[PDB]
């Protein structure tokens, strides 16, 4: 997490940076396979190390609240 920031920046900065990266790094259940293998390749880019699926998603999460709403309607 944000622990690499040393004793700098303050609570909120290391708080949000940690949490965001916590959820960002989580074992994500892949789209092209229900296997927990999705890794952030860059800003908004994701990939299932399993089936090699490279896809678009939120900047930090593979799926965004607004993204899930798309499939619905």
């Amino acid at each position: 997490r944000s622990g690499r920031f040393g004793a700098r920046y303050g609570r909120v900065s290391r708080r949000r940076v940690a949490e965001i990266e916590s959820e960002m790094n989580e074992d994500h259940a892949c789209p092209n396979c229900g296997e927990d293998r999705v890794d952030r390749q860059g800003t908004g880019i994701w990939q299932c190390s399993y089936c090699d699926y490279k896809f678009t998603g939120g900047s930090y999460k593979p799926e965004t609240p607004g993204g899930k709403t798309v499939r619905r309607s």
């Binding site: 920031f5 908004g44 993204g67």
Partner: peptide, 16 residues
């Protein structure tokens, strides 16, 4: 159709 990719970019602060 759809929302532009990369959503939530503005959520994390630049920090430095």
């Amino acid at each position: 159709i759809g929302v532009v990719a990369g959503g939530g970019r503005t959520d994390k602060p630049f920090v430095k």
